[PDB]
């Protein structure tokens, strides 16, 4: 089971030029493409080697789509400023998620084209790829225009056809990096907090994909209600990191174990703080 | 300081991506021409003056016709001193939605333009005139002209839907 998603951000900047349109593309947790309407010569660029060998005819087409989308999102920002009766002097954000989810069989699991306005859900293509769901009465106007323009047909065809095909191709051409397990490297660190307290931090480093779970357990008790869990970080090289900390009484840490389930493993790992001596 | 003529070639109603030309001219010999669009996206363009047969003309190429290029245009004919604004020219983009259907009662040669896409307005033309739709019982929306058609939405009366069946 895999995924391909495009994330778009259009931000209006009234007195300082056209709205900035940024679009990034992902296969699962791996970015492969990028577009920035503020670059010197705005062009869709590759960000993963398994799209660098696509012809210039590919990148020219993608770039044309991106420029047109920048214009259409400028227009959309204007229209939504109108719909909500908002001033022409504020900065507003329009976001989009589009793309296809592939089941374990490779067939289309789910087609997505959803849009948020100022971080709030605005309008979403429904799973039948034939109807829309509008969050308020301004989005109903957008729904009527979308319907009259047969937008769900073009989108339904992109999602059912081009999206799934090219995701299959991306997945094969980068079968190694993309379909590899890649489990996390682990260890447990000990840090003196104060008299009668000290922190145990459990590390998971260098893993792909990003989905992972670590939990601290004292002997049996599940201290998630007391565990400090940071959100999963990018290490910077396409892999991910995470840690979980628990505050414990000094000299009582052997009761604690870190339990770690991830894709690149079978047996969920259980590791404890081990001083070397 | 005399208002010029603003003429849309080959007409005021443009289809998407189709470059259309705005001609501004007068027997007054300004060496500068300023074109102003009011509407969704206000803008002002500068062409330098052309002189031919006693008329100063200016051909404003407005390019691949997009939504942001529809609106109401005027032009003004010494860079600072400008003329009185020309008569206004409503320039619309067409080609965005599904075209409606034209029934008539009774004769073929009380019209009607129909679609179940709930347009807010409808329009006409020959080689204009408007009316806003009113819904009904079978799930359709309707307007009819007492006596070529287009649809449009209330918030954008310059973005029209597709050249319907001729008649």
């Amino acid at each position: 089971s895999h995924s391909m998603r495009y994330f778009d951000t259009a931000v209006s900047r009234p007195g300082r030029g056209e709205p900035r349109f940024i679009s990034v593309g992902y296969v699962d947790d791996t970015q492969f493409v990028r577009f920035d309407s503020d670059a010197a010569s705005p062009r869709g660029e590759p960000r993963a080697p398994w799209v660098e060998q696509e012809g210039p005819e590919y990148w020219d087409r993608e770039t044309q789509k991106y420029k047109r989308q920048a214009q259409a999102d400028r227009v959309s920002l204007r229209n939504l400023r109108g719909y909500y009766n908002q001033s022409e002097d504020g900065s507003h954000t329009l976001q989009r998620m589009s793309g296809c989810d592939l089941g374990p069989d490779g067939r289309l699991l789910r087609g997505y084209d959803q849009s948020a306005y100022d971080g709030k859900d605005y309008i979403a293509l429904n799973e039948d790829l034939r109807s829309w769901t509008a969050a308020d009465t301004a989005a109903q106007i957008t729904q009527r225009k979308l319907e009259a323009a047969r937008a769900a047909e073009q989108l339904r065809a992109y999602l059912e056809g081009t999206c799934v095909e090219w995701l299959r191709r991306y997945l094969e051409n980068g079968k190694e990096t993309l379909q590899r397990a890649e489990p996390p490297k682990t260890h447990v660190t000990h840090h003196p907090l104060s008299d009668h307290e000290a922190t145990l931090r459990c590390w998971a480093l260098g893993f792909y994909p990003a989905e992972i779970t670590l939990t601290w357990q004292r002997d049996g008790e599940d201290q998630t209600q007391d565990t400090e869990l940071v959100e999963t970080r990018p290490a910077g090289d396409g892999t991910f990191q995470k840690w979980a900390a628990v505050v414990v009484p000094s000299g009582q840490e052997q009761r604690y174990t870190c339990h770690m389930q991830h894709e690149g493993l079978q047996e969920p790992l259980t590791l404890s703080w081990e001083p070397s001596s | 300081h005399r208002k010029p003529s603003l003429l849309a070639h080959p007409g005021p109603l443009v289809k998407s991506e189709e470059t259309v030309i705005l001609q501004c001219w007068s027997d007054v010999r300004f060496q500068h021409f300023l074109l102003h669009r009011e509407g969704k996206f206000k803008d002002t363009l500068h062409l330098i003056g052309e002189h031919h047969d006693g008329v100063s003309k200016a051909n404003f190429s407005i390019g691949p016709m997009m939504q942001d290029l529809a609106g109401t245009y005027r032009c003004y004919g010494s860079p600072y001193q400008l003329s009185a604004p020309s008569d206004p020219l409503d320039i619309v983009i067409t080609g965005l939605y599904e075209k409606p259907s034209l029934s008539a009662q009774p004769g073929p040669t009380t019209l009607s333009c129909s679609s179940r896409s709930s347009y807010d307005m409808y329009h006409l033309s020959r080689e204009e005139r408007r009316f806003s739709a009113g819904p009904k019982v079978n799930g359709t929306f309707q307007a009819d002209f007492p006596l070529r058609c287009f649809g449009s939405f209330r918030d954008s009366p310059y973005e029209w839907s597709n050249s319907s069946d001729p008649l």
Partner: peptide, 9 residues
């Protein structure tokens, strides 16, 4: 492969 163009919102 990015999605194809659509009318504005």
């Amino acid at each position: 492969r990015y999605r194809p163009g659509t009318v504005a919102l």
